[PDB]
Design a protein around this ligand. Structure first.
Ligand SMILES: *[C@@H]1O[C@H](CO)[C@@H](O[C@@H]2O[C@H](CO)[C@@H](O[C@@H]3O[C@H](CO[C@H]4O[C@H](CO)[C@@H](O)[C@H](O)[C@@H]4O)[C@@H](O)[C@H](O[C@H]4O[C@H](CO)[C@@H](O)[C@H](O)[C@@H]4O)[C@@H]3O)[C@H](O)[C@H]2NC(C)=O)[C@H](O)[C@H]1NC(C)=O
Ligand SMILES: *[C@@H]1O[C@H](CO)[C@@H](O[C@@H]2O[C@H](CO)[C@@H](O[C@@H]3O[C@H](CO)[C@@H](O)[C@H](O[C@H]4O[C@H](CO)[C@@H](O)[C@H](O)[C@@H]4O)[C@@H]3O)[C@H](O)[C@H]2NC(C)=O)[C@H](O)[C@H]1NC(C)=O
Ligand SMILES: *[C@@H]1O[C@H](CO)[C@@H](O[C@@H]2O[C@H](CO)[C@@H](O[C@H]3O[C@H](CO)[C@@H](O)[C@H](O[C@H]4O[C@H](CO)[C@@H](O)[C@H](O)[C@@H]4O)[C@@H]3O)[C@H](O)[C@H]2NC(C)=O)[C@H](O)[C@H]1NC(C)=O
Ligand SMILES: *[C@@H]1O[C@H](CO)[C@@H](O[C@@H]2O[C@H](CO)[C@@H](O[C@@H]3O[C@H](CO)[C@@H](O)[C@H](O)[C@@H]3O)[C@H](O)[C@H]2NC(C)=O)[C@H](O)[C@H]1NC(C)=O
Ligand SMILES: *[C@@H]1O[C@H](CO)[C@@H](O[C@@H]2O[C@H](CO)[C@@H](O[C@@H]3O[C@H](CO)[C@@H](O)[C@H](O)[C@@H]3O)[C@H](O)[C@H]2NC(C)=O)[C@H](O)[C@H]1NC(C)=O
Ligand SMILES: *[C@@H]1O[C@H](CO)[C@@H](O[C@@H]2O[C@H](CO)[C@@H](O[C@@H]3O[C@H](CO)[C@@H](O)[C@H](O)[C@@H]3O)[C@H](O)[C@H]2NC(C)=O)[C@H](O)[C@H]1NC(C)=O
Ligand SMILES: *[C@@H]1O[C@H](CO[C@@H]2O[C@@H](C)[C@@H](O)[C@@H](O)[C@@H]2O)[C@@H](O[C@@H]2O[C@H](CO)[C@@H](O)[C@H](O)[C@H]2NC(C)=O)[C@H](O)[C@H]1NC(C)=O
Ligand SMILES: *[C@@H]1O[C@H](CO[C@@H]2O[C@@H](C)[C@@H](O)[C@@H](O)[C@@H]2O)[C@@H](O[C@@H]2O[C@H](CO)[C@@H](O)[C@H](O)[C@H]2NC(C)=O)[C@H](O)[C@H]1NC(C)=O
Ligand SMILES: *[C@@H]1O[C@H](CO)[C@@H](O[C@@H]2O[C@H](CO)[C@@H](O)[C@H](O)[C@H]2NC(C)=O)[C@H](O)[C@H]1NC(C)=O
Ligand SMILES: *[C@@H]1O[C@H](CO)[C@@H](O)[C@H](O)[C@H]1NC(C)=O
Ligand SMILES: *[C@@H]1O[C@H](CO)[C@@H](O)[C@H](O)[C@H]1NC(C)=O
Ligand SMILES: *[C@@H]1O[C@H](CO)[C@@H](O)[C@H](O)[C@H]1NC(C)=O
Ligand SMILES: *[C@@H]1O[C@H](CO)[C@@H](O)[C@H](O)[C@H]1NC(C)=O
Ligand SMILES: *[C@@H]1O[C@H](CO)[C@@H](O)[C@H](O)[C@H]1NC(C)=O
Ligand SMILES: *[C@@H]1O[C@H](CO)[C@@H](O)[C@H](O)[C@H]1NC(C)=O
Ligand SMILES: *[C@@H]1O[C@H](CO)[C@@H](O)[C@H](O)[C@H]1NC(C)=O
Lengths: 389, 367, 260, 146, 49
């Protein structure tokens, strides 16, 4: 009110909004494969000279089935991260399955040093694959050492990008540290070069109810209160909008069920108080806001009462009826009275009366009075002209 | 909440405009206060709350339809429930918009109408001007007829007939109201238009207003601060435009309805508390009385209008000159069917032989 | 024969659930009473032609035994550009996009009871040749009512093929009817079936068949080929979230008033 | 603080803000002007009907029966003094719609019939002024039975 | 025809601004109806000619 002395009445103030309590995330199960459906998983890989190339499709593109294993020393892509791979959607990934020497792992990296790799696996100028180092000695290990994984490829013609050393008798577990057989698992993939029909994996959280929480359902972010909904969605229907096209009903992606959505309870705050010098005690109420919430943020209360228009605070309910002193709503007004404290009552609509009607009864006035009653009316307001320029 | 719902930087950006929020809330605040004042002003025009006596000996009339029903927990007149039932719409807070319930509730609003009816029937206009004075209904009607230039004898000589017409008329209006619904157009129109305006306001949140999207979080999540600031800035302009427009429409409609409320109050204090002589104001035809009725967001009036029915052509003359002295009627008019001359009331054929008392002398034949 | 549509071509435009709402929508649609060419796939003549794909094509037929095994979506259908394959058997579809070189008659062609009055498979031209590929997939081994069981004609399979901005969808609805004549006067909605953003071009559309047939009795196979258009449709929702009625906003003045 | 080619942009934004405020202010203004003008017409009519002459309209010129009015110039407004007549004390009496004198019904020329309980009198309808029920007070219309 | 007279590009752009003009048409039509209603009520107060 910009004044040190407020008058008797009710005055609006800052609104009250229920704060979010936490966030909750729900997302679906197994999804579509571009990446490493099987390349990272097998007991036998293809030949080094016939380095494998697999097109992978339509199982879960899960790094939670690949990144879960702690065997890999480092799997962190230069351009992306496996942790953030959940949201990322791919177009196609190719599998480089073959067996090479333990010292030839980094030889698979782009711009490698050493011509041993080019003969068996040429490095493309635009490689997006991610070098992954995972223990693979036992899988390729042989009792006498396998020579089948030979590097006899010595074509004199130059080797192009994906157009299609032998210091050990074979791959033996007795080979020294770094000299053991190794298996290359690189997710060589292209994005937007092929049509997108795939997406990555996801993660889920727990479930809550009857709380103002932040919800994410298949990307459906928002804030509100969720509750089990008796509504019956269609088998292929997941979202529910109101007449004004506002989401009200959602279906849990993991467990089939429809949940209601309700905006977090809120409403205006109005302060009831008599004149300052009459008393410094004040009565505060929340408009259309139940006091099931009010202890959020004097929050103790100890003097509360629910009303159709709201659940006020600080005023003591009175079951008698008196003349309205300060309008509140739903036929409730508050006043300061006896020790003196603000009270709330119901409309004493007036002096109940019963005129003695009868068939042959007349009440003629025997006397009169002259009464002068004032009356005021606006006539004109101060004129005003504004010089635009 | 509506503009930058749960977005601090959005709210911080809006602070540039600053005070705009305060005026809009104040404008609406005034409107809300006006609504309660209007309803209270038109209805709460009785110091006391009179009650209808249990003995309904109103000279043969029945008012059961308009009288409250004690058995009904909502002590409303039967018509009121009919009016309440006919009015048909949801609307709840979604994005900051809220609805403030009216200060008065239909339960007590009905009491005003109940008390007003009792005072009217049991005390006529006396309670309007001050202390309520009981008056037998039959006599009260006689006073009304005197107001419209009809002598009391007409009412008493045909009291039984009038009762049947009045009671039948009340029965008829019920069925007309129950059958058709176009009568409630005005009240229904206000709700629909008011509801329609809110819907459009909410829908406007979906428009990008030339921005990349209409979802603030999406813009915030994607774009970096500088670019995101520009996008939201445009969104603030568009959203702010919608609010000030809607509030303006609310102000105009509130301005119009307020005038209607004042008109209702003028009818309320004149067509009910008294017998207005304004032709066609309190219903078509000559006016006798009125009965208010509480309806949602509005009010319904029951004008009781007198109407001449059957006419017979007569031969008349301005005056009569008896002994060289002209005679003029004290009231009414001279009329002869063609054989004898009669004087009768201006609005009912009650022939009476012309006599000295019924007339007065002035001038002579020639003038 | 240019037969006329009555109420078909209605499908849910979104997964959104609306109850007792007269939601209005703008999208590719089959205009009400917009008439559609009729094709009778014959077995001495033949009526299995190549038709354009004008950004949304509606299909419906009363066939049985999956005589129309599937369809071919692509640009060239000659392995110059990747082409789709929709051939479906009693088990499932084998959706396939590859640089595929087809043939003049690239369907399996079960010519049962045709000439020698028996059952046989004289060719397997479905896989003419897949020179090279970019993606392939076989849907879930379901069992949908595609085999030969007429009884009272109920195999009213409606297909709408929408491939917008790289997302390709499939809406259909098994429509059990009793009238064996031209499309009955009924209202139904094609529920979404599958989305597969194959991203390929499509601007042409040859269907597939399952059955030198000179003198052989004609083929009791018939179907419709409608084309959706971008139109504003006033759509109904019952208490269920099911489309009970629909109205076009440009068919006639009366409908436009409803839309307005 | 800024060279021309970008300074107008900042200027342009300010123009929109200030111009928008003027519209809000001006748009807000004339709405009140219509309201007060509507109120003014109400006041003018009250002056014409409650001051220049007595008005029979009930409660329009003050509470209760209206006798006359007096205005008073006030800053930007007008103040009325509604001199109203109000009954004070009422003692109710038994009545009768008509009097059967000699088989012919009688009704008052004006007023109303009342009785202390023994005799009967007729008096005006807004102040107890009993009088003997004579022929001049009343008039004949029909017979008693009806 | 006032804002984006005969320009689909302009017509598409205003669509991003909600349906502001749609309210304007409704208000204007309401004004037009009021005029006809006003004229009828003030004059046509007697049915018989
Ligand atoms: C409502 O009001 C009154 C109720 O009392 C009724 O009218 C009254 O009736 C009585 C009798 O008719 C009137 O009494 C009159 O009093 C006069 C004054 O003297 C009185 O006091 C002395 C004191 O010693 C007594 O000795 C004396 O007897 C009186 O009691 C007397 O002078 C009167 O006597 C004679 O004159 C009057 C008038 O000429 C005659 O009517 C008498 O019959 C008698 O011959 C008389 O006694 C009293 O004044 C009346 N008051 C009124 C009219 O206001 C009404 O009937 C009742 N109204 C109705 C409609 O019913
Ligand atoms: C969408 O919801 C509607 C229901 O409004 C549903 O259409 C069917 O309509 C009837 C009523 O209109 C539904 O029956 C009602 O609900 C139950 C089940 O029927 C009962 O309380 C009542 O029916 C009883 O009485 C019938 C008398 O013949 C019995 O036959 C019956 O078995 C019950 O005992 C009441 O009338 C009916 O449930 C729905 N059908 C279904 C499947 O809900 C429509 O099918 C629903 N569609 C979807 C996709 O949800
Ligand atoms: C215009 O109005 C006139 C109203 O008076 C009509 O004249 C009257 O017509 C009636 C016809 O019934 C007549 O009454 C006759 O019957 C009555 C039955 O009770 C009786 O009471 C009447 O007695 C009167 O007349 C006799 C003489 O015959 C007198 O001795 C009586 O004292 C009494 O006055 C009676 O005859 C009315 O009498 C008669 N009124 C007069 C003054 O004559 C006109 O007919 C009518 N004209 C037109 C064109 O409409
Ligand atoms: C995705 O993976 C989860 C992993 O469980 C699947 O969970 C579904 O929901 C709950 C999870 O606790 C399970 O249902 C339970 O079934 C037992 C059976 O005895 C029953 O007693 C419980 O009351 C509860 O219903 C179950 O794992 C599974 N529910 C099913 C299959 O009906 C989920 O189904 C997987 N699929 C999707 C789309 O999320
Ligand atoms: C807070 O607001 C609500 C009004 O919406 C008031 O309490 C509500 O009253 C009923 C009865 O308890 C509850 O409905 C149902 O009650 C049954 C009782 O068995 C219960 O089993 C159901 O789960 C359901 O609650 C309703 O939930 C309840 N809502 C609340 C408490 O939020 C209440 O007056 C208000 N709290 C106050 C005034 O402190
Ligand atoms: C008073 O107003 C009431 C109506 O509010 C009038 O009373 C009428 O009385 C009759 C008989 O009770 C009702 O007729 C029928 O009564 C039977 C038995 O209850 C019922 O089953 C029928 O459906 C029908 O109601 C009638 O309903 C009722 N209303 C009307 C319009 O006639 C009465 O005429 C008024 N006058 C008096 C002196 O009460
Ligand atoms: C009253 O009378 C007029 C006309 O007088 C009628 O004709 C006279 C010759 C004489 O017989 C009177 O008693 C009659 O009443 C009526 O008006 C005319 O009615 C006729 C049909 O009856 C019609 O052709 C005319 O157009 C009407 N107008 C005129 C100027 O003649 C009138 O109906 C009667 N009104 C009442 C209340 O009785
Ligand atoms: C009105 O008079 C009644 C009773 O007074 C008696 O009867 C009258 C008809 C009249 O003839 C008086 O001169 C008599 O002395 C007063 O008492 C009321 O009576 C009615 C029932 O008869 C009852 O319902 C009321 O409750 C009674 N009220 C009181 C205070 O007793 C009544 O006070 C007088 N005033 C009014 C406004 O009615
Ligand atoms: C049509 O012919 C039979 C019917 O089941 C299936 O053809 C082969 O079925 C076996 C499994 O029993 C699969 O291993 C083959 O891959 C199927 N062949 C092909 C080309 O897919 C098949 O179900 C039907 N053909 C389909 C679905 O394309
Ligand atoms: C794939 O991973 C599983 C679980 O870690 C493992 O048991 C298995 O050895 C791997 N599969 C093959 C064929 O090696
Ligand atoms: C302050 O005190 C006096 C009463 O003693 C007074 O006139 C005034 O009403 C009080 N302040 C208010 C807001 O009432
Ligand atoms: C008030 O009085 C009513 C009597 O009906 C009683 O039910 C109620 O408990 C009382 N409440 C208080 C606070 O006194
Ligand atoms: C099909 O549509 C066009 C235009 O309505 C019409 O000219 C033609 O006759 C129609 N033919 C059939 C079979 O509907
Ligand atoms: C029937 O069998 C003969 C045997 O060769 C074969 O030539 C002929 O094509 C068959 N007819 C059909 C319709 O398959
Ligand atoms: C398929 O093989 C061809 C020809 O050798 C080659 O050009 C192309 O890269 C491969 N992929 C296709 C045609 O999709
Ligand atoms: C499809 O888009 C690709 C990309 O240019 C192009 O190669 C092909 O010719 C297009 N074909 C059609 C029918 O649009």
């Amino acid at each position: 009110l910009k004044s040190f002395t407020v008058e008797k009445g009710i005055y609006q103030t800052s609104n009250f909004r229920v704060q979010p309590t936490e966030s909750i995330v729900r997302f679906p199960n197994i999804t579509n494969l571009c990446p490493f459906g099987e390349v990272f998983n097998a007991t036998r890989f293809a030949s080094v000279y016939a380095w494998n190339r697999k097109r992978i499709s339509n199982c879960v593109a899960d790094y939670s089935v690949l990144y879960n294993s702690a065997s890999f020393s480092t799997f962190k892509c230069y351009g992306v991260s496996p942790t953030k791979l959940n949201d990322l959607c791919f177009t196609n990934v190719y599998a480089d399955s073959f067996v090479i020497r333990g010292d030839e792992v980094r030889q698979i990296a782009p711009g490698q040093t050493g011509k041993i790799a080019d003969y068996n696996y040429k490095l493309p100028d635009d490689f997006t694959g991610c070098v992954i180092a995972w223990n693979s000695n036992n899988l390729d290990s042989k009792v006498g050492g396998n020579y089948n994984y030979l590097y006899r490829l010595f074509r004199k013609s130059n080797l192009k990008p994906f157009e299609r050393p032998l210091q050990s008798y074979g791959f033996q577990p007795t080979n020294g540290v770094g000299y053991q057989p190794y298996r290359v698992v690189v997710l060589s993939f292209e994005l937007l070069h092929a049509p997108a029909t795939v997406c990555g994996p996801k993660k889920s959280t727990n479930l809550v109810k009857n709380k103002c929480v932040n919800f994410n359902f298949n990307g459906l972010t928002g804030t509100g209160v969720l509750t089990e909904s008796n509504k019956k969605f269609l088998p292929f229907q997941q979202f529910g909008r109101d007449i004004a096209d506002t989401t009200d009903a959602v279906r849990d992606p993991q467990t089939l069920e429809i949940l209601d959505i309700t905006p977090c309870s809120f409403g205006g705050v109005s302060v009831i108080t008599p004149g300052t010098n009459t008393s410094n005690q004040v009565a505060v109420l929340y408009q259309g806001v139940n006091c099931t919430e009010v202890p959020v943020a004097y929050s103790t209360g100890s003097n509360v009462f629910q009303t159709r228009a709201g659940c006020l605070i600080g005023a003591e309910h009175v079951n008698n009826s008196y003349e309205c002193d300060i309008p509140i709503g739903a036929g409730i007004c508050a006043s300061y009275q006896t020790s003196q404290s603000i009270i709330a009552y119901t409309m004493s609509l007036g002096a109940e009366n019963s005129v003695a009607y009868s068939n042959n009864s007349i009440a003629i006035p025997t006397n009169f009075t002259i009464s002068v009653t004032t009356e005021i009316l606006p006539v004109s307001m101060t004129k005003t002209s504004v010089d635009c320029t | 909440m509506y503009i930058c719902g749960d977005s601090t930087e959005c709210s911080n950006l809006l602070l540039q405009y600053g005070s705009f929020c305060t005026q809009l809330n104040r404008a609406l605040t005034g409107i809300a206060v006006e609504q309660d004042k209007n309803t209270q002003e038109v209805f709460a025009q009785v110091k006391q709350i009179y009650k209808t006596p249990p003995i309904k000996d109103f000279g043969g009339f029945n008012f059961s339809q308009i009288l409250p029903d004690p058995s009904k927990p909502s002590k409303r007149s039967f018509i009121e429930d009919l009016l309440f039932n006919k009015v048909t719409l949801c609307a709840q807070k979604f994005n900051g918009l809220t609805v403030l319930p009216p200060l008065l509730t239909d339960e007590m609003i009905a009491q005003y109408t109940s008390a007003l009816l009792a005072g009217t029937i049991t005390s006529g206009w006396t309670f309007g001007a001050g202390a309520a004075l009981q008056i037998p209904f039959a006599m009260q009607m006689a006073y009304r007829f005197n107001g419209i230039g009809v002598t009391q004898n007409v009412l008493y000589e045909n009291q039984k007939l009038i009762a049947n017409q009045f009671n039948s008329a009340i029965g008829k209006i019920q069925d007309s109201l129950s059958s058709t619904a176009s009568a409630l157009g005005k009240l229904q129109d206000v709700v629909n238009q008011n509801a329609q305006a809110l819907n459009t306001l909410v829908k406007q949140l979906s428009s990008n207003f030339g921005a990349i999207s209409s979802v603030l979080n999406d813009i915030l999540s994607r774009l970096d601060p500088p670019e995101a600031e520009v996008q939201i800035d445009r969104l603030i302009t568009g959203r702010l435009q919608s609010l000030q427009t809607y509030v303006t429409q609310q102000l105009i409609r509130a301005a119009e309805i307020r005038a209607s409320a004042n008109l209702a109050a003028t009818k309320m204090s004149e067509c009910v508390l008294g017998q207005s002589k304004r032709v066609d104001f309190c219903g078509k035809g000559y006016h006798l009385m009125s009965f208010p009725q509480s309806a949602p967001h509005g009010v319904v009036f029951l004008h009781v209008t007198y109407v001449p029915a059957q006419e017979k052509n007569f031969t008349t003359a301005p005056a009569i000159c008896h002994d060289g002295k002209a005679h003029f009627p004290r009231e009414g008019v001279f009329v002869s069917n063609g054989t004898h001359w009669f004087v009768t009331q201006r609005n009912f054929y009650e022939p009476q032989i012309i006599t000295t008392d019924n007339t007065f002398v002035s001038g002579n034949c020639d003038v | 024969a240019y037969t006329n549509s009555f109420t078909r071509g209605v499908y849910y435009p979104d997964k959104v659930f609306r109850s007792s709402v007269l939601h209005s929508t703008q999208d590719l649609f089959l205009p009400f009473f917009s008439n559609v060419t009729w094709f009778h796939a014959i077995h001495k003549r033949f009526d299995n032609p190549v038709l354009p794909f004008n950004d949304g094509v509606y299909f419906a037929s009363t066939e049985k035994s999956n005589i129309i095994r599937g369809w071919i979506f692509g640009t060239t259908l000659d392995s110059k550009t990747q082409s789709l394959l929709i051939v479906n058997n009693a088990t499932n579809v084998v959706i396939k996009v590859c640089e595929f070189q087809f043939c003049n008659d690239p369907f399996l062609g079960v010519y049962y009871h045709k000439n020698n009055k028996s059952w046989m498979e004289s060719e397997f031209r479905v896989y003419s040749s897949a020179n090279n590929c970019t993606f392939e997939y076989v849907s879930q081994p379901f069992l949908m009512d595609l085999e030969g069981k007429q009884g009272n004609f109920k195999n009213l399979r409606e297909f709408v093929f929408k491939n917008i901005d790289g997302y390709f969808k499939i809406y259909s609805k098994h429509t059990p009817i009793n009238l064996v004549r031209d499309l009955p006067q009924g209202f139904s909605a094609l529920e979404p079936l599958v989305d597969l953003p194959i991203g390929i071009n499509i601007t042409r559309f040859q269907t597939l068949l399952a059955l030198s047939s000179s003198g052989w009795t004609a083929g009791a196979a018939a179907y419709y080929v409608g084309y959706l258009q971008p139109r504003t449709f006033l759509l109904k929702y019952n208490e269920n979230g099911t489309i009970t009625d629909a109205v076009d906003c440009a068919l006639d003045p009366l409908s436009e008033t409803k839309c307005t």
